[PDB]
Design a binder for these strands. Structure first.
Ligand SMILES: [Mn+2]
Ligand SMILES: [Mn+2]
Lengths: 161, 612
DNA sequence: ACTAAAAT
């Protein structure tokens, strides 16, 4: 049954290694891909999951991201105002995202106004990318159409003083 | 002589004005023993019978609060003794003017008393002091009739004064007691802290002999503002901007500068990616065009705070020098009362007449005549606080009779008065948005339509620039080159006098007639120095004072404490508190705080070792 | 010698 369960999760785009799938759920007489998804969305992706991001994505010779992907945010920083004033309405908001999946870390840039991802979004939040995503100079362009935000808290061990 | 009544005013000029208005031109003037106060006599009617009116004035406060003997000489009483065991009394201020004896001799034989004092909070205290002076010597009352009277007025116009005489009232003892409590509290706290500080630090740290270290509810917060600014300057680390700009040319020798919609980027790689996305391009498309009208608001009336701000920011004048010049102009008879915090013109005012008086000076004669011909505009509405009408010209001066500072202030006052009654300024702002590849830039410009108060206040003018070319959507243009610029964030600069005044006003520290005194005090005690640009720079001794106050007990250097104490004291005025029950508690809390401060002075002592 | 209020 896991043979078809893996295909189902791949078609959904939630790519994750089979050992991680087994760890997340181990045959309670049925795979129940739905509860597999719900349990995963509150699990740290560094431990569990396979490597699928294109190699040397942080360089400048890929220019394309095809198919759907699932990624985990780590740090969110507003590169539009100094660290002294974390939010000043003197320039439009502009967000840089440090995403990861497995072994490779990638950087993304807002490039529009997206209300789903805010400065208060805690790490560990899951992002699904659908369609074609552009890579310009090792930077992933995050249009409002090709984003989906799925929550989940794993370790919000972060404090702003 | 059947019956005479007596009237007391707080200024001799105001006394003469009211006497003239109510006496219908018939006066008998005489000079008193002081030499600065005059007595006016005239006949009239008060309460159904003919009455002789006698009008006089007193110069400001009459009594000030102080200590008795054996406690006003230091080195003989412990400072902690002053808090709740030192007898207190009232003694004359300005003893050269025998105000009490003058009041007694001029009120002897009077029957009724009417008080034309100011309507603010600091006026009813003078009211009750005058009663304490005059009531002992006066004809005793008959039956159950009321003798003491008070009048309420705002302006010095005919109708206002006559109506104020028509309707009368009574004073407020509960309102006077609040001011009395404030005076007692301030004197106790200041004399307690200053003595200990200047008796400890003077004899143990070398070059502070013959020096005074002072504490109070105003000087200390004023210093706190400046040292907070100094700390903010000292703890700033620069960052790096990255702004992207490009220029588009339509006709030969007609280029156009543009601005990025996203103003700043703080990542070098991100900025480089955006540049590489734009650099190799040759078209410029047009997205949208804008055309809206707008107005620049005419200035409000003139307050003392705004006078001081403009004097210190545009005329190179200290607050005390400005106040002295304004007072001299008032005494000579050229401008109205220069200590007011009301920014709303009185309903009854000869605005047209005052404007028509200044219809001959070559600097603004054309504008004055044009306004008189085409009809004036109503003033902008604003706050009212009783007190006195705003600062307006009264006579017509020239460059010759006045000189230097007086003329420099008079020009600004007259120009502000003319501007506050003129029209507004209308300008059209055109913004055109271009698109370069994946990014969009904008450029904006202004053009004037009908100048208003700008004709009298040129420094508030709208700058002139070449009009943006008219374009329709879909047009394409060539672009010269797209380049980047690197910039650094700039640290803040030291406080200016205008900024300090506007910080003082909002927090309640000081008042309309005490800001110059406090600033000059902290300048004279070598706490701050005035540098180029009229900027107040903290010195070593002041930095140590505040950095020690924060470490020892933080509410001393804290702007909100004065407001909190004032709010607590207003209960006495409102009739919902008890005088002793409030004063004793508020003195006890401060006594405990001082007794903690004296035993926790090692922390501040270990801070001057890194200096003198 | 202190403090904080009005006035000329
Ligand atoms: Mn007054
Ligand atoms: Mn006032």
């Amino acid at each position: 049954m896991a043979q078809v369960a893996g295909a189902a999760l791949s078609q959904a785009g939630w790519y994750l290694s089979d050992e991680g799938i087994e760890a997340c759920t181990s045959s309670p007489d049925k795979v129940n891909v739905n509860d597999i998804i719900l349990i995963a969305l509150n699990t740290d992706l560094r431990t569990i999951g396979k490597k699928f991001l294109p190699s040397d994505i942080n360089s400048g010779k890929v220019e394309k991201l095809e198919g759907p992907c699932v990624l985990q945010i780590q740090k969110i920083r507003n590169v539009a105002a100094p660290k002294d004033n974390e939010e000043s309405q003197a320039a439009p908001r502009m967000l840089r995202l440090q995403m990861t999946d497995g072994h490779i870390s990638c950087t993304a840039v807002e490039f529009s106004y997206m209300s789903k991802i805010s400065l208060n979004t805690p790490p560990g939040t899951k992002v699904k990318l659908s369609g074609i995503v552009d890579i310009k100079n090792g930077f992933l362009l995050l249009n409002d159409s090709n984003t989906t935000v799925l929550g989940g808290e794993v370790e919000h061990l972060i404090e702003k003083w | 002589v059947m019956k005479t009544v007596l009237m007391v005013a707080e200024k001799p000029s105001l006394a003469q004005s009211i006497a003239k208005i109510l006496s219908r031109g018939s006066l008998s003037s005489h000079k008193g023993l002081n030499g600065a106060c005059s007595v006016h006599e005239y006949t009239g009617t008060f309460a159904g019978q003919p009455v002789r009116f006698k009008m006089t004035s007193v110069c400001g406060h009459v009594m000030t609060l102080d200590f008795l003997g054996k406690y006003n000489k230091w080195d003989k009483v412990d400072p902690a003794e002053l808090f709740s065991q030192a007898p207190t009394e009232k003694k004359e201020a300005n003893p050269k003017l025998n105000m009490v004896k003058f009041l007694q001799v001029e009120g002897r034989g009077c029957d009724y008393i009417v008080l034309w004092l100011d309507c603010d909070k600091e006026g009813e205290n003078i009211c009750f002091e005058v009663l304490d002076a005059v009531l002992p010597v006066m004809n005793k009352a008959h039956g159950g009739e009321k003798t003491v009277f008070r009048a309420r007025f705002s302006s010095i116009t005919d109708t206002d004064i006559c109506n104020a005489m028509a309707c009368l009232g009574e004073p407020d003892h509960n309102e006077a007691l609040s001011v009395d409590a404030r005076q007692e509290l301030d004197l106790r706290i200041g004399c307690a802290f200053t003595r200990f500080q200047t008796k400890y630090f003077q004899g143990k740290y070398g070059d502070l002999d013959s020096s005074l270290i002072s504490f109070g509810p105003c000087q200390t917060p004023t210093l706190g503002f400046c040292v907070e600014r100094h700390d903010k300057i000292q703890s700033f680390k620069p960052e790096t901007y990255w702004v992207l700009q490009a220029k588009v040319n339509t006709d030969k020798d007609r280029s156009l500068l543009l601005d990025w919609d996203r103003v700043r980027v703080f990542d070098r790689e991100i900025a480089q990616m955006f540049l590489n996305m734009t650099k190799l391009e040759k078209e410029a498309q047009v997205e949208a065009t804008s055309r809206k009208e707008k107005a620049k608001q005419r200035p409000l009336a003139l307050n003392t705070v705004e006078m001081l701000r403009v004097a210190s920011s545009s005329l190179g004048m200290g607050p005390q020098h400005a106040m002295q010049t304004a007072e001299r102009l008032y005494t000579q008879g050229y401008i109205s009362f220069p200590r007011t915090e009301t920014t709303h013109y009185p309903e009854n005012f000869d605005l047209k007449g005052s404007l028509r008086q200044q219809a001959n000076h070559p600097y603004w004669a054309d504008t004055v005549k044009r306004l008189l011909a085409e009809g004036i505009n109503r003033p902008r509405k604003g706050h009212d606080a009783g007190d006195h009408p705003p600062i307006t010209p009264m006579k017509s001066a020239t460059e010759a009779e006045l000189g230097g500072d007086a003329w420099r202030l008079y020009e600004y006052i007259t120009r502000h008065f003319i501007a506050t009654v003129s029209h507004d300024c209308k300008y059209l702002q055109s913004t055109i948005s271009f698109r370069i590849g994946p990014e969009l830039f904008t450029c904006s410009g202004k053009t004037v339509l009908s100048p208003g108060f700008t004709e009298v206040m040129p420094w508030q003018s709208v700058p002139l620039e070449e009009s943006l070319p008219t374009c329709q959507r879909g047009d394409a243009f060539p672009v010269g080159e797209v380049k980047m610029l690197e910039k650094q964030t700039n640290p803040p600069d030291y406080l200016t006098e205008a900024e300090l005044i506007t910080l003082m006003e909002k927090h309640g520290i000081g008042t309309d007639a005490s800001i110059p005194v406090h600033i000059n005090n902290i300048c004279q005690r070598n706490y701050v120095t005035v540098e180029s640009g009229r900027r107040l720079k903290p010195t070593n001794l002041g930095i140590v004072l505040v950095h020690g106050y924060y470490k020892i007990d933080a509410e001393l250097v804290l702007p909100t404490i004065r407001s909190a104490v004032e709010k607590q004291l207003n209960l006495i005025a409102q009739g919902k508190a008890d005088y002793r029950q409030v004063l004793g508690h508020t003195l006890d809390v401060f006594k405990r705080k001082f007794h903690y401060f004296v035993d926790s002075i090692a922390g501040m002592d270990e801070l001057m070792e890194v200096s003198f």
